[PDB]
């Protein structure tokens, strides 16, 4: 039960079902004590059953219960578990990620196969918690809250900070992903090369595996945190460590377009 803007309250439908159940159970106990005729007791027992139903699974038996003012059925426990964008169904769409990011991609021709151009402004946010600690290790900040307050404004960004970010991302790699991810190579790991500009620079050779072109495709970026996750990304997932199609056994990273043309 939570209050929103204005004085209005937003709350789950479950609470109404629980409520009517309780009302009917209590009225039942009362009617029992009063020694009421079995007619009324039956009616209340029945309404109690129906209420327990509607709570557990709404609409499955009899008419669906609705709050006055709307024809929408109250979402019950069964609906919550599955079937109207349900638990098991919500876990198909996926959960948002904390260290993620997204931008528009442009061609990276100067990049080596294992590298990707990452906007400085973007990398700063992605790697920030590591960056604070690297600001502490250097003489750029006294403490964490300090460095954190230092990055809060773009005008307050020192030219020493980028030298620290370059240290943070040294040896590290990030994941680039382009939707739809049809096969595993739709997500690859590159080591980031910090660049001016708002675009992610992508190696041309990996465009085929990603099915990525430059007409305005965007790619998501992710940061592996654990030394473990980093390791996995760097051996198993590194762009330059998958040269051949896991499907056909033939090379996936190969000369194409302009390259072929020139050669």
């Amino acid at each position: 039960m939570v209050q929103v803007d204005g004085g209005r309250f937003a709350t789950s439908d479950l609470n109404d079902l629980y409520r009517r159940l309780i009302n009917r159970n209590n009225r039942l106990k009362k009617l029992l004590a009063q020694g009421a005729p079995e007619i009324i007791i039956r009616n209340e027992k029945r309404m109690l059953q129906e209420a327990v139903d509607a709570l557990l699974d709404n609409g499955r038996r009899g008419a669906p219960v609705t709050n006055p003012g709307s024809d929408r059925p109250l979402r019950s426990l069964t609906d919550i578990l599955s079937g109207k964008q349900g638990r098991f169904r919500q876990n198909l769409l996926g959960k948002r990620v904390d260290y993620s990011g997204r931008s528009v991609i442009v061609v990276g021709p100067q990049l080596k196969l294992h590298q990707c151009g990452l906007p400085k402004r973007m990398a700063l946010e992605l790697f920030k918690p590591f960056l604070l600690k690297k600001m502490e290790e250097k003489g750029i900040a006294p403490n964490v809250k300090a460095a954190r307050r230092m990055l809060e404004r773009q005008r307050d960004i020192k030219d020493e900070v980028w030298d620290a970010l370059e240290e943070v991302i040294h040896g590290k790699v990030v994941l680039l992903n382009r939707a739809p991810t049809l096969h595993r190579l739709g997500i690859q790991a590159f080591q980031p090369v910090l660049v001016e500009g708002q675009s992610i620079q992508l190696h041309p050779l990996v465009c085929e595996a990603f099915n990525a072109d430059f007409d305005g495709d965007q790619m998501a970026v992710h940061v592996p945190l654990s030394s473990f996750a980093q390791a996995e990304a760097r051996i198993q997932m590194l762009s330059a460590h998958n040269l051949l199609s896991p499907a056909s056994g033939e090379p996936l990273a190969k000369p194409s377009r302009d390259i072929i043309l020139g050669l």
Partner: peptide, 14 residues
Amino acid sequence: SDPVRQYLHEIGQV
């Protein structure tokens, strides 16, 4: 089904 009808019938008996 339609317990209103059921109960109203039970009442109709009396």
